[PDB]
């Protein structure tokens, strides 16, 4: 419809652009991804692993990615400035494992041969914001240890490690567990803390799964034992609480069908999270989201990038 | 930028590939090292000692190695075809001492247990060019004696021993000194000479530190005394002078920050060394390097292995 | 022939022949009678032309080509039945003249197939008669010209 | 089978309850209709005619009605809040004709005698939403004339009359045509227009069947000849388009087997109608339905009223 | 490179490089690791060297060249996999001296490749070492000279 008219009739305001990260707000970059182009990226459900991906669909500044060789039911949407995709050849050049297309073996796969065989184009390098050409985030090296909140069970703070570093971000892994609970973040993430934070703050520390003598867990001896060093305390940066207020309006991807982006409202707030409500729909669809999540955007984002906006119901 | 265009505007040529050792030139090998993988290697500052190392970073055909248990400030870069790294278990199988991760004791360390405890992967054997599976270099056995130029004080030729043999290379040790001055080489090294070379050539021989009656040093009686034999003269091979010429251009690791490789030029030459100049930078950064040093490479090396190239200033 | 989908736009998609030029490509929908699922040739009896310059042409295996190219076959439930059209010989209509597409003429159905009709321009030689798909955009019901404001060429 | 799991599997959304009329969505009313109860109702195929009907089956908030005296092949289903059914005694108190059970004459039928002969019970009055006690549709009187779309032949707009008024609705009848073309509506119906509408729009007006001089049908003369008035223009109200969107999911009664209600999707939209598709079935069974039709319902309607739901396929 | 069969003698054939000096020709058999069917370079992403003085060296095309020359390609089925040899480094043998072919010397396998061995003459400089195909007529097992009556040169 139009935002201008909607804000008059609702007597409301939009969340100002300044409240968002530059990456959530930027509309002036062209989407250079094209149908059929090949690339590499993380599997969202297994964020430690990399796969060969094909551009299946483009919609404004977003794209839908397909896992080569696998079912179309695993297809997923990202923004064109996603740091979780990389150009062909990136795995080899940066020390990452490639999970190759269904039916191949890790070391049977060659990009050269694959491209000859498919007659496909690799998405050009200059499309990617993340190619490991930038010096890492300060003080977070692979193997280093920290304390991390299980985002799936937020009443737990757990023994964790850095297991991956790519440009300004790093992968938080929970020791002796699956990669299923892992997540990417930066040094200002409010979900991570230095070694010794639990004991100093009062809350208990969940030790690694199947660890000998769980209640008797000592950090300094775990470190010596695993030949690891703790991430240094000066590395953990303060991210201030966001400044979103209740009733501010914005645009948000619908989690029930991620092809769609809707008119939305801030229903509630925490220090680092906002509760999204889709205007005109039931509150039952309301969901909590991190303020720096890639799938929320300032009013106007859709119109300026060429993606349809679902009006309110 | 591009080499092709640069050579036109400068009216210069690159050092041809044929001028380099195969190992400095090879671009078609994949870097199979991955983040977090564990291995063994020499400490560059103490080239007689071996440590447990973790892959901290990969950049094209290079990797940065971390000393498990120790500070990240000691991290260092090698090429993936480095002969100075070895697979897990190599020390035990070949008669070398392991300096274990900080806080362990030599004989308290087990690879099995360490891997269970860290849940890490050992870098697979097939990655390593040097695993002591090749018959040694001809006529150089441990304990044997020779004359060697102190590379740190090149006006000295000194009493030396072979103290380590690994595939085609061996470790030159200066008698009664620290391992700090030791260095790895092959039978064609122009820095080593047979017993009796000093006296035959005219220059004086520096005898071992704290040796009784230094000016009164006799080789044949030192040998009998130490139950050692001299490396036989037929063992010392002629390496011809290199054929690099002034103004030839190439690629070279920046010694001020070894993560970086730059456009460079041959500024000057000796029989076995070249003087490197980084194009666009001050001559004050010019440095002498052995022609067979692993950190110099033919133009194109970076582009073909996936490592960034710093253009000239 | 072995083909791929290389473009999708609203209800239609582009059929591309593997290892060839785009010159032979064409747009269609899921009911197109020109497309068939993987394994249709072998099941029906006719031979399958494999991609141009393919290694061992007579020895072509679909399931291994698919694995090799990291592709999946379009699923058989996707291919819809379009019924044969119901045009009959002598029915008259309006049709763009292919010799000069600015012009539209009085025309007649001269012959029929399941999915194609043969057009004849009334008053002109049969030598100008041409086969066309029944769903081609350049054929139209009598009256189309008059109701849209385009001149109609009367018969000769 | 559950809606929740299916929606997640399909990245699909159901039509919200808010898009439906209250009468289509209401699940918390009890069905007080019981087997063997007798009542009066319209024949759905001849909606101007009234018959004695018996409850033959009850399924959730729905009931199957049987025409007394006639074959069970004519049985049909309604909802318990249907305005097309009436209590015993209604026809006589409201000026409606009864088509009596097969073999009776109209003057011959008496409810008290019939109930005694059958030993049956009349459905109680409190079950019925429509007893002709509520306010009539403003401006629409029995005998008044209008222009109406033939919903059987929707290219035609025709001479029509109001022939029945029941609570807030009225019956549209096509002058001298079969009563099978009659339909019930309200003042907001998009299918009716004031006398003169066709003329104002430049549309052909279909005159009454067997009109003595079909060439020169004239409204003024016809009204005068027939002793009839036009429904005044002010009575006709704009009904806003519905807000259903393509791909929204819902529940719909199966037209071919009306005992059944199926998982359905909105295949297409018009201003006042939706095209229904039954999930898993051929598109050849798709059908257009008015958005206010009593036999479409929000997801969850069957489970909440106790009617089985047919899953997709 | 673009090549032709120009001679057939018993179980072997001669490979000739189109319009190049005959000094580059060599004899082989179907199992030779040095020959490949027409199209191999394209399939491997390797540059193909066209014939010498080819009229339009930019756009050499196999189909056109075959047609122009009235020539067929050797069919792909004719090309056989030859297994690598099983020589190992340091094994000893007898080899004819390349520089003085009257002589046969005590030799060692200095290095291996799949189908070739690098020969070193015991006692001599490594600068005289040379690569040789494993099927070459001038390498022999130890004892060959003594059993056939040829002098053997000892190491040195």
Curated annotation (Swiss-Prot), chains A, B, D:
Where does the entry say this protein is expressed, by tissue? Widely expressed. Expression is reduced in colorectal cancer cell line SW480 and promyelocytic leukemia cell line HL-60.
| MBT repeat positions | 1-101, 109-208, 217-312
Q: What is the effect of changing residue 278 to A?
A: Does not affect binding to monomethylated and dimethylated peptides
- Tell me which UniProt keywords the record has, alphabetically: Chromatin regulator, Metal-binding, Nucleus, Phosphoprotein, Repeat, Repressor, Transcription, Transcription regulation, Ubl conjugation, Zinc, Zinc-finger
Q: What is the effect of changing residue 150 to N?
A: Strongly impairs binding to monomethylated and dimethylated peptides. Abolishes binding to p53/TP53 monomethylated at 'Lys-382'
This protein's major location comes to: nucleus
Assembly behavior: Homodimer. Interacts with RB1/RB (when monomethylated at 'Lys-860'). Interacts with p53/TP53 (when monomethylated at 'Lys-382'). Interacts with CBX3, ETV6, KMT5A and VCP/p97.
What's in the domain note?
A: The MBT repeat 2 specifically recognizes and binds monomethylated and dimethylated proteins. In contrast, it does not bind trimethylated proteins. The MBT repeat 1 does not bind methylated peptides but inserts a proline ring in a Pro-Ser-Ser/Thr sequence context.
Identify this protein by name: Lethal(3)malignant brain tumor-like protein 1
Organism, by scientific name, is Homo sapiens
What stretch of the whole protein does this chain cover? 274 to 586 of 840
UniProtKB/Swiss-Prot annotation, chains C, E:
MBT repeat ranges are 60-155
Q: What is the effect of changing residue 97 to N?
A: Does not affect binding to monomethylated and dimethylated peptides
Q: Which gene name does the record give?
A: L3MBTL1
Organism equals: Homo sapiens
| Interaction with monomethylated and dimethylated peptides as annotated region, ranges | 17-24
What this chain does, per the entry, is described as: Polycomb group (PcG) protein that specifically recognizes and binds mono- and dimethyllysine residues on target proteins, thereby acting as a 'reader' of a network of post-translational modifications. PcG proteins maintain the transcriptionally repressive state of genes: acts as a chromatin compaction factor by recognizing and binding mono- and dimethylated histone H1b/H1-4 at 'Lys-26' (H1bK26me1 and H1bK26me2) and histone H4 at 'Lys-20' (H4K20me1 and H4K20me2), leading to condense chromatin and repress transcription.
Q: What further note is attached to this protein's record?
A: The L3MBTL1 locus is imprinted. Paternal inherited gene is expressed, while the maternal inherited gene is silenced.
Q: In which tissues is it expressed?
A: Widely expressed. Expression is reduced in colorectal cancer cell line SW480 and promyelocytic leukemia cell line HL-60.
Subcellular location(s): the record lists: Nucleus
Q: What name has this protein been given in UniProt?
A: Lethal(3)malignant brain tumor-like protein 1
> Per the record, what is the consequence of mutating residue 1 to F/R?
Strongly impairs binding to monomethylated and dimethylated peptides
Record remark: domains = The MBT repeat 2 specifically recognizes and binds monomethylated and dimethylated proteins. In contrast, it does not bind trimethylated proteins. The MBT repeat 1 does not bind methylated peptides but inserts a proline ring in a Pro-Ser-Ser/Thr sequence context.
The lineage, from the top, is: Eukaryota, Metazoa, Chordata, Craniata, Vertebrata
State the post-translational modifications. Ubiquitinated in a VCP/p97-dependent way following DNA damage, leading to its removal from DNA damage sites, promoting accessibility of H4K20me2 mark for DNA repair protein TP53BP1, which is then recruited to DNA damage sites.
Which part of the entire sequence is included in the shown chain? 431 to 586 of 840
Describe the protein's quaternary organization and the partners it interacts with: Homodimer. Interacts with RB1/RB (when monomethylated at 'Lys-860'). Interacts with p53/TP53 (when monomethylated at 'Lys-382'). Interacts with CBX3, ETV6, KMT5A and VCP/p97.
**UniProt-reported outcome of changing residue 121 to A:** Does not affect binding to monomethylated and dimethylated peptides
Per UniProt, what does mutating residue 17 to A do? Answer: Abolishes binding to monomethylated and dimethylated peptides. Abolishes binding to p53/TP53 monomethylated at 'Lys-382'
């Amino acid at each position: 419809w139009s935002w201008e008219s909607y804000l008059e009739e609702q007597k409301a305001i939009t969340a100002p652009v300044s409240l968002f990260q530059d990456s959530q707000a930027v509309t002036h970059n062209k989407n250079g991804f094209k149908l059929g182009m090949k690339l590499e990226g993380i599997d969202p459900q297994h964020p430690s692993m990399y796969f060969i991906l094909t551009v299946a669909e483009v919609c404004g500044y977003r794209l839908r990615l397909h896992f080569d060789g696998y079912s179309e039911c695993h297809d997923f949407w990202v923004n064109a400035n996603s740091p979780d995709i990389h150009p062909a050849g990136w795995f080899e050049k940066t020390g990452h494992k490639l999970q190759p297309p269904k039916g191949y073996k890790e070391e049977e796969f060659s990009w050269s041969q694959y491209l000859r065989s498919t007659r496909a184009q690799a998405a050009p390098k200059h499309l990617f914001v993340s190619q490991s050409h930038s010096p890492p985030p300060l003080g977070f090296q692979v193997g280093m240890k920290l304390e991390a909140v299980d985002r799936m069970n937020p009443s737990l703070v757990c023994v964790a490690s850095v297991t991956d570093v790519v440009d300004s971000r790093f992968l938080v892994h929970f020791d002796n567990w699956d990669d299923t609970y892992d997540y990417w973040c930066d040094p200002s993430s409010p979900y991570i803390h230095p070694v010794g934070w639990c004991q100093k703050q009062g809350k208990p520390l969940t030790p690694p799964q199947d660890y000998p003598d769980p209640d008797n867990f000592c950090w300094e001896k775990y470190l010596e034992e695993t030949g690891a060093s703790a991430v240094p305390t000066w590395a953990f940066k303060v991210r201030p609480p966001h400044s979103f207020l209740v009733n501010m309006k914005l645009e948000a991807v619908d989690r029930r069908n991620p092809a769609l982006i809707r008119v939305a409202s801030v229903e509630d707030v925490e220090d680092h999270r906002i509760k999204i409500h889709f205007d005109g729909w039931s509150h039952g669809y309301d969901f909590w989201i991190d303020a720096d999540h890639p799938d929320i955007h300032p009013a106007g984002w859709c119109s300026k990038t060429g993606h349809p906006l679902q009006p309110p119901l």
